[PDB]
Design a protein around this nucleic acid. Sequence first.
DNA 1: GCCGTAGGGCCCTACGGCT
DNA 2: GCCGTAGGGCCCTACGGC
Lengths: 672, 670
Amino acid sequence: KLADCSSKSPEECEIFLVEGDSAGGSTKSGRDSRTQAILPLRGKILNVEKARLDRILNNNEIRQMITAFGTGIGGDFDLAKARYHKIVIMTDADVDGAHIRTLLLTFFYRFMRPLIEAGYVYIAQPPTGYKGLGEMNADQLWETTMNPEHRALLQVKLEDAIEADQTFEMLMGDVVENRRQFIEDNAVYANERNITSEMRESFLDYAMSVIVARALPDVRDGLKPVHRRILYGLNEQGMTPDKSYKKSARIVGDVMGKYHPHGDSSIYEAMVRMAQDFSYRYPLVDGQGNFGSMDGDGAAAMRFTEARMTKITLELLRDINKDTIDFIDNYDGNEREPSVLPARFPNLLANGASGIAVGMATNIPPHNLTELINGVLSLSKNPDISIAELMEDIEGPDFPTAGLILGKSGIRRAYETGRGSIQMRSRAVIEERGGGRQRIVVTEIPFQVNKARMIEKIAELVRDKKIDGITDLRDETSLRTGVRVVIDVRKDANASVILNNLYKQTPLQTSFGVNMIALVNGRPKLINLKEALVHYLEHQKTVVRRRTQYNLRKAKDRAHILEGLRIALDHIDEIISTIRESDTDKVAMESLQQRFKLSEKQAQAILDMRLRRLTGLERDKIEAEYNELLNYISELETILADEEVLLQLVRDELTEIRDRFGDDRRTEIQLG
Amino acid sequence: KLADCSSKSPEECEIFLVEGDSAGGSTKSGRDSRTQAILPLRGKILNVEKARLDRILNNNEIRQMITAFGTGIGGDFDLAKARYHKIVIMTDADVDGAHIRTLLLTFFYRFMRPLIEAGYVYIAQPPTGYKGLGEMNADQLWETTMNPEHRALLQVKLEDAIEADQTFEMLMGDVVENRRQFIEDNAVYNERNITSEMRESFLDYAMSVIVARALPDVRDGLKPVHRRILYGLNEQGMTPDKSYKKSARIVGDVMGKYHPHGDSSIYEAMVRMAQDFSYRYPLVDGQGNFGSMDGDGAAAMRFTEARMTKITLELLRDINKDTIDFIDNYDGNEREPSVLPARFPNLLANGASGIAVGMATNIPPHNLTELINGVLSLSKNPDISIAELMEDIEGPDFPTAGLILGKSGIRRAYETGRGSIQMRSRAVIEERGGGRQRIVVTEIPFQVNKARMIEKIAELVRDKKIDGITDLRDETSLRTGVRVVIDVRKDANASVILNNLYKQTPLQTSFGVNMIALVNGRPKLINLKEALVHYLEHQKTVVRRRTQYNLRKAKDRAHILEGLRIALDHIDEIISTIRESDTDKVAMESLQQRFKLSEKQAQAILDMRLRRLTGLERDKIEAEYNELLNYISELETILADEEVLLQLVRDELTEIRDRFGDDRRTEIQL
DNA sequence: GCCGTAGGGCCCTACGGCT
DNA sequence: GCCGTAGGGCCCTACGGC
Ligand SMILES: O=C(NCCCN1CCN(c2nccc3ccccc23)CC1)c1ccccc1
Ligand SMILES: *O[C@H]1C[C@H](n2cnc3c(N)ncnc32)O[C@@H]1COC(=O)O
Ligand SMILES: Nc1ncnc2c1ncn2[C@H]1C[C@H](O)[C@@H](COC(=O)O)O1
Ligand SMILES: [Mn+2]
């Protein structure tokens, strides 16, 4: 793995650390080989501030580095035996390289301090706008970043042992609470180097990145960027329900050239999760081929699979090209993307969310679309509606895997505060199997409980004689039968006691521990149910208001044009003779505007008209269209005038989603 | 790996063998778990007929299959110890599936023969046109392939143990000539019998590899996966003037439209085309880490970026002018080119290597200036000898430079299509001070890993097989270019060590020329005069069809323009006519009726916008027709005479030589 | 120790002809 | 034992809560 330099003279040799081999080859092809050694790593390195010494010292990349440096570590560390006098960090110019970078400083800091103290450690500054250094051309990497004559290494300064320790303790250490509070305080949601300055800046930039632009969903359409991009990716290449499937690999290439500069499996498996009906309560993707199973199996590889939108997914993208939502430059400015989807149903809650961020994490369960909506409706009529009153409509989450939820206290605590624990329970019955003996039949398991892994924890529990009663465990699941897991019982054993044991002892009963965080105005926030429904319904007010302002503007732009087309066709031949006497396109435009009182666009419209638009009935079609538009226009000014009318539309259109898409509660909420 | 079934009665238990987890996942889903086990393998299993008995038993997949059957092997076999009374071969429905099939049988037949005797070996029948079984939903894989009520299996039948021994030895044994002679022999361009499957299946594989994988086309020099690559770039306008599109987009364009195969096959093959130490006239221009002379792979395709070079435009030039026959891609959803115009002789310029089935090919690059001088000579002399030609084309011309030792292998190679040609690094001895010397190498042979080469040397010094060396450094720099230094012990002879380096290490290597290409969709060993004769014949046709095409299009455009011209003449009559027809269709009939126009001159008049009644625009129409009229009669000239035509191919060939023709890199020492 | 978006990469097979 | 298209798949790491 080590491409070493040739000179064995420490003082003038330096070593570069890079994220892996894609970067290695460009750095090996660009280095001055005499004095510069290259070490590739393997992406995210161990956080050593967190992991203990047996893990540390048995980690492949740390070993190589210690070896590489010849210094030993900790006590043993010694500065004379250093094989290089410049150890240079040179990670991707991206937030994930900024993190790797803090992961290395932490490591150097806890095991190789004297090294930062002799001023041996440096950070390299490659130019932004590449995905990794494996995207740079050889010379260019060398010239802007590795050539000792034009390059700009930041040398790492340690100024205060006290400050440094604390810094590290907070940012990299296991206590999430002080790392979280570091963020709230410093976050702004919109050449020698001080190691504390660097650690603080670099980890923040990564945290703020992970929080707003990765791991947590938006309140308004329920999605995290990758899902938004994918789903935006499909829409743009109209890979719609009524059209045939399309190749998983083209979709993912497209999405990764255009909206998502992250790896292909982070994206392809995002798309798969959206296709699985045991993951999404209302699947957003339609899946052709092997897309996984409840025994944890991965999808086929993405050359085999094909996909397109679910019908429900169109209701997220409806009204998108009517100015409803702001577009933003994508990562490289060659392309535009939606900052949010219209989302004509409350996605966040219906399909829920799970996500791990920094200094926090989120976990929102799925719900039943019929309930949500009826709930949104009640609140549309009563801004003061209480949480007791919402749970008349929304009984509680509703899993794609169904099963039971034991009681309303947890639901209640979690809808009131955004936090609470809900005990999920498999659907199990006890039934006879002939010969005077019984069995347990579970046919439904909790949400996010791997069945084969649960079926092994059970086998394990009987293998290790921690449970008396069980005579055989089989998995009789199939497409025909559905999920069917059978557990025989030994003759005469009570089977209720045995089932109950399994609930306490196995994932057969799991706790979903709700933590309803989502992105409210690009800043993360713990919300309870009413907050969530309010932001969403605030979002629909803007989606309809803006679609209607759009249509009105469009409608007026048209009627102006028909005002001009009417006049052509009412003066046709003197229009024709105006054009013919004139030589250039501009001089014609000059003459019509002035002659028949036109605007630029009208004259322009008149000049773009085909002769087939002069056939006889054409005049009338026009007049017929002008009048209906005037009507139309009037209506849309009604709807922007009266807030109640505006908010009455939203309902109507909401009432129509429910009608078309709403389905029966799957998960039962036993009480007691 | 094995997903077992619930029952322990082999009676009713059967086990389905698939390609992997892409395919196993869709099979695990669709199965009846009671009676139906699944062992997923991993791609091509070892060919036992060419393997050693130690290797075979160590082999992971082999072992899992043995355990699965639980019957032991050879003399320790036991038919009463069989865990499933039906073993089912359920591979992808593609040539490689077939291949894997044949391989699996070979294992069965050599070690578990009594399993085919006992009637325990079956072959499943998934539907065709899926890349894998993983492309299939579970339920649909169940209704077709796995459900006892609908599935149509084949019980593999052994009939004659001796034709089956001769047959396995022939197809899967390590003597090509028989296997080759089998393809030639058989090449055309329920219950089942084992021999009869083996021939038909191996033949489906071999034939696929030979015509649609491993062998270039004598016309454009391209394997299918390269051609598809260059068209993918064309059909996304990824041209050199435009910026650099991401490697993942292309690779994804190509896969789904064109090439139903692994994405690492594509990207690596597009990679090769960007590297200036591999291609003599690099076809792809890449932004980022594209590998090294030291064996370094390219960077992952999420990072790298690429477009056409300038010279690939020439391979593609006029592709869309019906210069070439399009054909239906794999799934019937797109059109892809059978071949590219190839406006310079790519096959020979960039050369080619591919390991086929029953045959291989290995052709070297050449210098484009000489190649084109060659073709010119041939155009004005059909009866030119390989030797005449050789006055133009000295010999090959590697992109890595170096020295060729002699002309005899070359001569041989162009007369017959086969020969050895000995390649040497360019190397020189020079002082370093103090009497002492070094050896400094600067170009190295084609296809030689500069790193592997150095290590080999370092192993030889350490093991003392080579004497008189005191150091060994690679001082290659992008700035100074390739530079390998070897420090001779004082007083030692440097020229002897050197000729010792050339005997023992890749410093000298041989290229074994073997010029097998596809001539009319059929694999053939050709020679220099045929490589160039089949190229010229392709130029004649490419250019003749374009100039035909270009004439059909002008004559159509002329026609329409004679329409617009009549409109402008009688414009107020036209107005009149159109205003007094209620509908378009009634205008259309009246306009044709009225002014003696064809159906198309009328639509185009109905289409004309008004802006085209302005003075400039009027003149614009008159310019187009006089110009095009004159163009037409030029096209008509060319087509009238084979010689004016041929001379055109020469003036176009000459232009390209002029523009991209470059200096010789490899020296031929007499 | 697993839920799910992120960074990062390596190894078995077939096939032919040269060494 | 390498060359070059093909079949096929696996492991490490961060991050937070339970
Ligand atoms: O970026 C894309 N593909 C990347 C190829 C991913 N390889 C897929 C298979 N890989 C591996 N699979 C199993 C085991 C592995 C073990 C070591 C290294 C790679 C492995 C390594 C990564 C892509 C493909 C098509 C369209 C868009 C992107
Ligand atoms: O690395 C092994 C393979 C190499 N080798 C080169 N050429 C041959 C041929 N023709 N046959 C066998 N091996 C060849 O030599 C090394 C040792 O050989 C084996 O054990 O295979
Ligand atoms: N809620 C929980 N908290 C901590 N460990 C849990 C856990 N659930 C399962 N485990 C397993 C994982 C490890 O095998 C081991 C201890 O944790 C550890 O050291 O990583 O126990
Ligand atoms: Mn429990």
